Amino acid sequence: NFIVLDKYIKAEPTGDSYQSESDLERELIQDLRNQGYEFISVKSQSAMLANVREQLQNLNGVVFNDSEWRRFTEQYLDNPSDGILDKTRKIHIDYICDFIFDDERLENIYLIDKKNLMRNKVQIIQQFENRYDVTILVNGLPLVQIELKKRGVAIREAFNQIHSENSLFKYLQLFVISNGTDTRYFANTTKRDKNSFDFTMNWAKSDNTLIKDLKDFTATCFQKHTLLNVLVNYSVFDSSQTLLVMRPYQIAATERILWKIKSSFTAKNWSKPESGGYIWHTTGSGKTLTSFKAARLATELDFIDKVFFVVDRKDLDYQTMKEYQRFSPDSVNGSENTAGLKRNLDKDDNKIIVTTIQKLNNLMKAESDLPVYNQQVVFIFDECHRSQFGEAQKNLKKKFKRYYQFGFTGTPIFPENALGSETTASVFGRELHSYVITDAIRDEKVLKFKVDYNDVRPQFKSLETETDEKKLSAAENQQAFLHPMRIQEITQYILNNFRQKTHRTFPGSKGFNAMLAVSSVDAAKAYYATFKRLQEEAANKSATYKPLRIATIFSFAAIGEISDETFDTSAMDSSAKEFLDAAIREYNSHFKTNFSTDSNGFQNYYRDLAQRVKNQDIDLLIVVGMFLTGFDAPTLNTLFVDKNLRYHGLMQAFSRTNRIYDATKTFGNIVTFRDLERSTIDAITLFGDKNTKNVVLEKSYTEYMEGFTDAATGEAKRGFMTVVSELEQRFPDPTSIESEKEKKDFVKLFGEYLRAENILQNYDEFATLKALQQIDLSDPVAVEKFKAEHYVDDEKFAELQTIRLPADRKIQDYRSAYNDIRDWQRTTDWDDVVFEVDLLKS
Ligand SMILES: Nc1ncnc2c1ncn2[C@@H]1O[C@H](COP(=O)(O)OP(=O)(O)OP(=O)(O)O)[C@@H](O)[C@H]1O
Numbered sequence: 001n002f003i004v005l006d007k008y009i010k011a012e013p014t015g016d017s018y019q020s021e022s023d024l025e026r027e028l029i030q031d032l033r034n035q036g037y038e039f040i041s042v043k044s045q046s047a048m049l050a051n052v053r054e055q056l057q058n059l060n061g062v063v064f065n066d067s068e069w070r071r072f073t074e075q076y077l078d079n080p081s082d083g084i085l086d087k088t089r090k091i092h093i094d095y096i097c098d099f100i101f102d103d104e105r106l107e108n109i110y111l112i113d114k115k116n117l118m119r120n121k122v123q124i125i126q127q128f129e130n131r132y133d134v135t136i137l138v139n140g141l142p143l144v145q146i147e148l149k150k151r152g153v154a155i156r157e158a159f160n161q162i163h164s165e166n167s168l169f170k171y172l173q174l175f176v177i178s179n180g181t182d183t184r185y186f187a188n189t190t191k192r193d194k195n196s197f198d199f200t201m202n203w204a205k206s207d208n209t210l211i212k213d214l215k216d217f218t219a220t221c222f223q224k225h226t227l228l229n230v231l232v233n234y235s236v237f238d239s240s241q242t243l244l245v246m247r248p249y250q251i252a253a254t255e256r257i258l259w260k261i262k263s264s265f266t267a268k269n270w271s272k273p274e275s276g277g278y279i280w281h282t283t284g285s286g287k288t289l290t291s292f293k294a295a296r297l298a299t300e301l302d303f304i305d306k307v308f309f310v311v312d313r314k315d316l317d318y319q320t321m322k323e324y325q326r327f328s329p330d331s332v333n334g335s336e337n338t339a340g341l342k343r344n345l346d347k348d349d350n351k352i353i354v355t356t357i358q359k360l361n362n363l364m365k366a367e368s369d370l371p372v373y374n375q376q377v378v379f380i381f382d383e384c385h386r387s388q389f390g391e392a393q394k395n396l397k398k399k400f401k402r403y404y405q406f407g408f409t410g411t412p413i414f415p416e417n418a419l420g421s422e423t424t425a426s427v428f429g430r431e432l433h434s435y436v437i438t439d440a441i442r443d444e445k446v447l448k449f450k451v452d453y454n455d456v457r458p459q460f461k462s463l464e465t466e467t468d469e470k471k472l473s474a475a476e477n478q479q480a481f482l483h484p485m486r487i488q489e490i491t492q493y494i495l496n497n498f499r500q501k502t503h504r505t506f507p508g509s510k511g512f513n514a515m516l517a518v519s520s521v522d523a524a525k526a527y528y529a530t531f532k533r534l535q536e537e538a539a540n541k542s543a544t545y546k547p548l549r550i551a552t553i554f555s556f557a558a559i560g561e562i563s564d565e566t567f568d569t570s571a572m573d574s575s576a577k578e579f580l581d582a583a584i585r586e587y588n589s590h591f592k593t594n595f596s597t598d599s600n601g602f603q604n605y606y607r608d609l610a611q612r613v614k615n616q617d618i619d620l621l622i623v624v625g626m627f628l629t630g631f632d633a634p635t636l637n638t639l640f641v642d643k644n645l646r647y648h649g650l651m652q653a654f655s656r657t658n659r660i661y662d663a664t665k666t667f668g669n670i671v672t673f674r675d676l677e678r679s680t681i682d683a684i685t686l687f688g689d690k691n692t693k694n695v696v697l698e699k700s701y702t703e704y705m706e707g708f709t710d711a712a713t714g715e716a717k718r719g720f721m722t723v724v725s726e727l728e729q730r731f732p733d734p735t736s737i738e739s740e741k742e743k744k745d746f747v748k749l750f751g752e753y754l755r756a757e758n759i760l761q762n763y764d765e766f767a768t769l770k771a772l773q774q775i776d777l778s779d780p781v782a783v784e785k786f787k788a789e790h791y792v793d794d795e796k797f798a799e800l801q802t803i804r805l806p807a808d809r810k811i812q813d814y815r816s817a818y819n820d821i822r823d824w825q826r827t828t829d830w831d832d833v834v835f836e837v838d839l840l841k842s
């Protein structure tokens with residue numbers, strides 16, 4: 001009885017009126033009632049509390065007197081000081097009130113019965129108090145809100161508009177918005193960085209096919225058994241108090257894992273590859289959230305004795321270390337130590353064990369008669385890299401007698417890229433669920449890549465295109481790849497363009513931040529020094545220079561694979577260690593921290609550093625191989641690459657930028673100073689087919705300027721230049737926006753202008769062209785200063801003067817008129833009109 005279906009037959013429309021919001025509401029209420037939801041009339045919170053009282057008394061087999069019920073209400077159900085986050089805490093964690101009655105007896109009052117899910121009462125009400133809405137009540141509590149809109153209302157624009165009193169609606173867990181054609185759901189959270197339209201979701205089948213229209217969505221997502229499982233078992237409330245409602249592919253993998261455990265155990269078919277399986281969920285789609293959730297659910301199987309959740313120490317960061325601290329405290333870090341692991345093994349009244357693959361492998365090497373070897377064990381592995389996982393499989397196959405193991409990866413091991421390691425299929429067995437990169441990009445759940453070799457260094461181009469590895473390793477020195485000029489030109493390019501790439505030029509726009517991945521410890525030292533020197537230079541030239549805050553971290557290591565670096569700082573050579581030492585000193589003075597480079601300090605520095613790159617206390621992080629495979633930073637959008645990446649390491653590193661955020665983060669920028677074009681196509685193609693690169697890789701500057709057709713859709717996209725031309729041709733101004741119609745058409749057109757400029761801000765050709773508009777062509781020093789900073793010659797310089805762009809004045813005239821029209825939105829038809837709210841606020 002899976003809740004993400006393998007097969008689904010589309011319902012038929014009634015033939016009745018299905019245009020207005022009250023049309024959608026009629027059929028939704030009717031459909032929900034056919035599915036066992038009792039409709040009640042509720043006109044007040046007083047009537048809501050009364051209904052809650054009836055449902056919780058039924059559920060819990062107990063009758064409150066009135067004084068008790070008022071007390072229950074003021075102190076647990078409906079505390080006046082509770083906010084949304086407090087009700088989510090109560091739904092997901094604190095759902096049992098141990099209540100003391102007037103006669104002093106003690107009873108557990110459940111808000112929700114989680115073990116007997118179907119015992120919960122589900123009800124529907126319509127909106128009471130202009131807005132058409134239906135609310136699903138679970139034991140009288142409002143947990144879902146369905147916002148209904150007219151057909152042909154832009155669902156996105158409606159979302160922007162709506163995202164005490166009455167306080168019971170703080171309990172809402174889930175939103176659904178629908179114009180009948182499209183239906184999206186999203187979590188009720190106060191975290192604004194999770195509140196953008198990018199975080200709404202379509203329901204779907206296990207093959208990932210969308211289920212969009214409200215009638216089908218009603219009959220699938222809104223089956224009591226579906227919706228209640230989504231609400232209770234497939235929504236995560238983490239240690240940072242963020243509610244995340246899982247996407248269908250995440251749920252689809254999870255339930256298929258659990259069902260596979262049970263049928264294997266019932267078949268007494270354990271400890272073979274046909275006992276478990278793997279999940280192919282593409283990089284950045286939620287493997288770490290999902291696999292961890294599936295491990296937590298697995299502990300609720302009464303016949304399993306211990307569930308191992310295994311991560312790679314390479315992949316740890318602040319948020320996930322905070323998470324794991326709650327379940328396996330002081331045990332999930334970067335050290336080789338197993339004391340914490342073996343202590344959590346001995347904890348009774350506990351089934352989940354989080355650990356790293358380095359630790360699990362160490363313990364299994366040294367220990368031989370652990371009780372857990374003969375128990376019923378689930379293994380859930382979250383992207384464990386090739387070399388350490390290989391030795392761990394040997395001892396696991398050797399020593400666990402009754403296990404069911406599962407793996408999540410975004411970059412499987414096929415015959416073609418095996419050389420050395422066992423294929424993913426041979427280790428884990430069947431592919432239980434797949435959600436691949438073209439799946440995720442079509443669903444807009446990860447971001448595309450803009451990948452460009454920055455070929456502006458002729459003296460060094462020969463090296464930066466070298467392909468023999470022997471030669472490439474031999475060029476990691478100051479005569480070649482670490483030539484001070486090359487390091488300077490590259491570092492200068494990054495300082496001249498960081499704000500352009502991260503969307504920080506036109507303030508007070510927050511923007512994004514970036515990483516720089518390099519080839520070696522010496523490379524990191526040269527770059528950190530050059531940045532330092534070049535920024536002290538800029539501080540003297542201009543006194544209005546605003547510096548970037550730069551940091552680095554690395555230790556010592558040891559195709560496709562990114563080298564594993566140890567957390568044992570005593571492994572490094574004296575020079576690397578004293579450099580990393582001096583960097584932490586500067587880091588300490590700035591952030592008023594006090595980390596050292598002993599093991600404990602380095603580990604805490606690593607943990608602080610991840611936090612500050614994620615929240616942009618750091619502008620640019622320089623690494624060799626750390627934070628390249630698991631680090632989750634939605635507001636990081638640019639990876640500067642001076643490194644030879646291939647195959648799965650390529651996919652992982654680039655994907656540091658691939659997190660969706662809002663409409664300002666159109667894709668991740670990958671700026672490379674070695675030519676990685678062949679490697680990018682080879683790596684994309686290895687994890688898809690020959691067409692996959694056309695979905696993953698962004699179009700050229702000429703395409704966004706002049707227009708193209710998205711082959712994935714058939715959607716013609718107008719070019720910037722066509723838009724700009726239409727703006728002048730049809731709106732040379734103020735009299736052009738006289739009539740309502742002309743106002744609507746202008747908003748539509750200027751919205752495309754804003755989408756196109758924001759895309760084009762990531763193209764060096766466009767930044768160069770914008771820069772030229774701010775120049776005295778008579779002034780020859782500033783003409784020469786622009787040529788050298790944008791790498792244009794006298795020929796290229798000639799051509800760009802001919803490209804006519806609209807003046808800053810006419811743009812800000814467009815901008816404020818656009819705002820007028822937006823704020824006025826309090827014959828002609830405004831429903832389909834999406835204002836570009838995020839791009840504005842930028
Ligand atoms: N269902 C969801 N709802 C809301 N947010 C989500 C959901 N799934 C993933 N995210 C967000 O997307 C980001 C990436 O998730 P996560 O790091 O678990 O992915 P991953 O696949 O392990 O990535 P990597 O391949 O880089 O290790 C996180 O910030 C996460 O909170």
Ligand SMILES: [Mg+2]
Nearest residue numbers: 287288315630
């Ligand atoms: Mg991960």
